Ligand binder design. Structure first.
Ligand SMILES: CC(=O)SCCNC(=O)CCNC(=O)[C@H](O)C(C)(C)COP(=O)(O)OP(=O)(O)OC[C@H]1O[C@@H](n2cnc3c(N)ncnc32)[C@H](O)[C@@H]1OP(=O)(O)O
Ligand SMILES: CC(=O)SCCNC(=O)CCNC(=O)[C@H](O)C(C)(C)COP(=O)(O)OP(=O)(O)OC[C@H]1O[C@@H](n2cnc3c(N)ncnc32)[C@H](O)[C@@H]1OP(=O)(O)O
Ligand SMILES: CC(=O)SCCNC(=O)CCNC(=O)[C@H](O)C(C)(C)COP(=O)(O)OP(=O)(O)OC[C@H]1O[C@@H](n2cnc3c(N)ncnc32)[C@H](O)[C@@H]1OP(=O)(O)O
Ligand SMILES: CC(=O)SCCNC(=O)CCNC(=O)[C@H](O)C(C)(C)COP(=O)(O)OP(=O)(O)OC[C@H]1O[C@@H](n2cnc3c(N)ncnc32)[C@H](O)[C@@H]1OP(=O)(O)O
Ligand SMILES: COc1cc(C=O)ccc1O
Lengths: 240, 246, 246, 235, 247, 238
């Protein structure tokens, strides 16, 4: 995959697809061009039997500084663009076929929260800094940012961070439940890899069934899930 | 001035911050039909008053609130006309959470002391909450011979883990403010001496934001909890565009 | 006397507390179709027994339950008619959560040791839970080649945060009792040596409440998680007024 | 002469609530909204009032919405809702829209908030909103969703085309369309029938139904037995 | 099956299991006895391969005239409060917990009266054919209670909003043609052709792979409760499950 | 759009874009190739000022006879995703109004794009059926939900369970489509409705139709919030 995308890099090592956001000079701000390439990246890696697990990380100091202000600014064109943001950030990614891990190396802001939580698991550096700074720019959180908070962070802490726009570090992200674990930057990569390797060792069809089933069952009552969760178990047995 | 305006509630505005003080301290701020009707009045008035940028909900004396008024809200009412009971229940809701949970302006519970039973609805209806270490909390309904009434259980469901919520509802054991913070019921517990100033600093942060934007953000978050991600794509973009208009 | 009544389970009552003991410790209390059927009978029976006011679900020997019986419940059922698989799954759900999640009487899981896989459904169905620090937990399903079956994933979703739930479900890693309390899976982890004492203490607090009021409280909480605030205004007052009747 | 914009009459337990802005085809102003809240709240505590029939004065039932800093809008939107459906949908007492003529736009919400509806064949309905450049506002679109099938709802919303009392009965929008010369008599037979019911039980029944549509079967086993037990208490 | 239940009769007929509510002296009123027997009947038939389709009908002039007012209360007051939990659960158990997502396809053959508590099993049955001569009514209100158990939900699923509210609120009676026109039943036909029409339908159902039929009908009933996005996941899970189990 | 797509055709005439399913030799059966091209079609038409309303129709006798009856397991995920992508994920909440003009055979997987389209007119002469059950599959993709949304409970279950076909007039009486007209009069009746819609402000039309489909999922209280937001979003995008 060398040199194939202008704003993103993919480097696969032993089954682990590192997907690197690559606009370091713009702190990996998400522009419409990055959005369209990320869609391409996800669809491509889906059908690549070399990629058993995807690790979503950032080049340089940012994981992502959020949506690209300049590069985002005919009425209907905003339709397409907002769709393209959703398409990779979570429509493909939340229920992706393969297991996914956010490896948060640094800055994570605003619209970054959507792919952050769409990725199944997440590890950050203690040194990573997060914040929902939309309120200070005069917009509520856009896209799925607020649902991504609601799914991972308790009600009062979500509201505090959304309403104030204050930043918090990696330990605090983990305390809150936004990520699985926060570790020193120097251990970020190996901790992530150790986890990806554990996941690589499961039957991919089974893992998909388990991870999609959990995400879905939060939406459903116990009686609905009896039907739903056995349908997944049985679907897993067909396809495995 | 709102001086002398209500019998059971005082409003004191400082610098954009409207301190709403439940004011039945000889009855530990027990929530009676008079208080419930005046609190409706209060929220509607403050809503339309540009001098109030943030509402801080707090109590006079030792209590924040000791709960619904056992005399005036329950015992005096329960043997009278059914249709009045239903009206009284509804008036309690109207201010505890119907106007308050999606209130136009940002809201903070400042819990100075006792907080029992029906006080959990407005507690959680307020966007944010700081309590005092010295504050005692309890869901004492079970020990009084009723399940939690109104939205008390949903207030718990929204902010506290399932195990912890069931434990406190079922046993009716009390817990103090550091425990309230740890469980997620409030944002922060601080010693009483430091309560007002900690609350004041959060309120000034909130007063710096564009109110309309702050309203879209807080309202959108509370509602997105109820919706799937696909529903939220629609809904949350609608709230951002609605916000842009306004 | 419930003595000798069932092959795979025991019931011991003790001053209002009915200890329901999963009893196949040679097989680490693996849940076979026979245990499932007998547990249905247990639960229906004790529902109507006034001598039993709180149920404590525990295991004989070293395990709470090692999960579904790999042989009796999986291997042997796959070799029978398809239509029987249907009956078998239904019978598992019947006792694990269908009767048990909204059971009439308060329930506590007293998790003395191993709890795996299918064990998580009755675990979270039970209202409250105390485990031994020494107890080991595991969603080993992934490592056996299946996603969690029955209501196991829902069990986690209700009690354990999103990231933590996926971590354990996706990796199949085990964790001990203190980490289970920390995650919100149980109420409390204590040494094994103290487990029964602490549980009885909880059960006795529960026996003090009015049973019908307690029912209403614990049922209304579990259902209110499912409903918006406006739906719950209706629902939760109907629970309160149903409780006053009964 | 209690209200400016609304007349009320109570005969043999039937409270006719009459929208009374005839000159304006009963278009719903902020003043009427505020007064309608007063009306509903007043009539609820009235021991003589058993059923409420909601109609318009002269020829319209209502022509819909009658068309201060930003935040005042919050208040005007809330007051509309408060009488149209927040109090009205789950009203303590049984409720009948007696739709005598014109029924456009925002009048769809109290229309459907009322338990039952009898219209006159000669009545015209419309979701004109579109033609004026706005999508249906308040709860108009949900009211259609509740009562009129998917295809027809979208049809009348998207086109703004109008329809008679016969086509409204047929679509599920109302219970019956009958001639305007019989509208009142038909409505009153229904109302009398409803008055003979135990009011608390009727309330448990009608509220029960409306909620149960949002709930699953299992959720409803809990819930509808709670309304029933609730009824045994309050009755 | 012969003479095995005091209040129900089962007649298996070359794949079609006719299940007959059998208290015609009492208009097939559903007592606690009948509730308990109907649970046994539904569990027994599920596992009997001679039953491919269940047809639920009543002996006599009635389908069922609702809950048995006399023996519900007779049994309930001979006992404490908790006895009502058990009795209500047993009613729900056969009327719809087992019946609504039943493994085998089901048809209500409604030959006469169908009142109150009867609507739950009627709607739990996948499909329904009635006699023009059959009379339906929700008379709970005239008896001074709201519809109990799943009756109002049974209505909400099959009959439009105004019409359900009208019949629940008034307790007014309606006939077979009306019931089919309201969407309560699939079809209404003269009582003389009731058995003919039902059996044609049951035999059509017999043509299909049982597991595939179960997947289709269960998945349709669940899907009403779910969004499109949710159904994308759910409905392909049922399809794949069917392919695994269809044999 | 002359000869741009292999299995589909586009013909705009004065605001109306006719999207024509174009495998009449296979009764317009939906192959993976068709699914990919339909995505591309729906995206392209979304950004074209020329198309104001889309009309979804079939070349030859069929509207569509349903899915066209592999490799690594993963390939299925993609093919299932691309089926849904045009049938309803793009189509159900499409920016521009959509009408299904059902000229003939409508089977199985064809009910998903049928119900996703906002409005529908079929020919009396058209035949529908949910033939899945007969081939030993329950209905796939969003077929059962498409029924659940437009057709009553007893009827949906009837047609799903029996696999019996029904004509255009029965389709309209069930609620599957808006209206059934003779075939001879399908293009005319449809164009006239298409034209009524073209007279609406597009952004206002999108708010109203998306808001209606979504409000079916929400309580009254959720809808007060959601419908007033949609209205205010409308007034901005203008
Ligand atoms: C829904 C949403 O996404 S809204 C959320 C976006 N909100 C934000 O608050 C991000 C704003 N950015 C920042 O706070 C900072 O750039 C930080 C903290 C991430 C890093 O700060 P520094 O290390 O001081 O870097 P600095 O501020 O010089 O930014 C470096 C470059 O990245 C660009 N950049 C950073 N963030 C963004 C962004 N979100 N969009 C577009 N460009 C950005 C900066 O403009 C700058 O460009 P330049 O040097 O070509 O002029
Ligand atoms: C659904 C519900 O909300 S049910 C009720 C839930 N609330 C409770 O269980 C709180 C009960 N415990 C108390 O109320 C105690 O008063 C505490 C812990 C708040 C504080 O106790 P103390 O400072 O020792 O005060 P004490 O009990 O003597 O009473 C203070 C005064 O307020 C009254 N009061 C306190 N709480 C309430 C209440 N909820 N309702 C009515 N009156 C109350 C007392 O009756 C007394 O009034 P009096 O002098 O006119 O009789
Ligand atoms: C969907 C599901 O529920 S998949 C199954 C989920 N369960 C599991 O993954 C737990 C499987 N069990 C184990 O790993 C172990 O038995 C432990 C850890 C609980 C206990 O370890 P040990 O003390 O070393 O006991 P050991 O493995 O020797 O078991 C003793 C007996 O219990 C039986 N047993 C234990 N668990 C089960 C089970 N889930 N099903 C059937 N039999 C079981 C063993 O097969 C063995 O039988 P045997 O003596 O007749 O040969
Ligand atoms: C929760 C609920 O289900 S609300 C109750 C709903 N059911 C009803 O309202 C049905 C009431 N019954 C009736 O309306 C009539 O019995 C009809 C229409 C069913 C049949 O009328 P008829 O042919 O005149 O028969 P009739 O009324 O003489 O009753 C025949 C016998 O069946 C009994 N019976 C009929 N319905 C019931 C019932 N729901 N519960 C108990 N017994 C009943 C009658 O009491 C009578 O008993 P008896 O003759 O041994 O003393
Ligand atoms: C309780 O029944 C089951 C439980 C599990 C747990 O993984 C899997 C399949 C089952 O049938």
């Amino acid at each position: 995959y060398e040199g194939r995308w202008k704003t993103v890099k993919v480097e696969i090592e032993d089954g682990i697809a590192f997907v690197i956001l690559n606009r370091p000079e713009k702190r990996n701000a998400m522009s419409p061009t990055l959005n369209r390439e990320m869609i391409d990246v996800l669809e491509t890696l889906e059908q690549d039997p070399a990629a058993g697990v995807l690790v979503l990380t950032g080049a340089g100091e940012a994981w992502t500084a959020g949506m690209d202000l300049k590069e985002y600014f005919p009425e209907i064109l905003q339709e397409k663009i907002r769709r393209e943001a959703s398409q990779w950030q979570w429509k493909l990614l939340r229920m992706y076929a393969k297991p996914t891990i956010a490896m948060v190396n640094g800055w994570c802001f605003g619209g970054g929260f959507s792919p952050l939580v769409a990725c199944d698991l997440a590890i950050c550096a203690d040194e990573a800094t997060f914040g929902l700074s939309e309120i200070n720019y005069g917009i509520p959180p856009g896209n799925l940012v607020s649902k991504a908070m609601a799914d991972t962070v308790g009600h009062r802490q979500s509201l505090y961070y959304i309403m104030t726009g204050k930043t918090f570090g990696g330990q605090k992200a983990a305390e809150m439940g936004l990520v699985n674990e926060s570790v020193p930057l120097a251990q970020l990569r190996e901790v992530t890899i150790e986890l990806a390797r554990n996941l690589l060792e499961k039957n991919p069809v089974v893992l998909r069934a388990a991870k999609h089933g959990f995400k879905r069952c939060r939406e459903l009552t116990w009686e609905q899930n009896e039907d739903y969760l056995y349908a997944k178990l049985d679907q897993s047995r067909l396809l495995d």
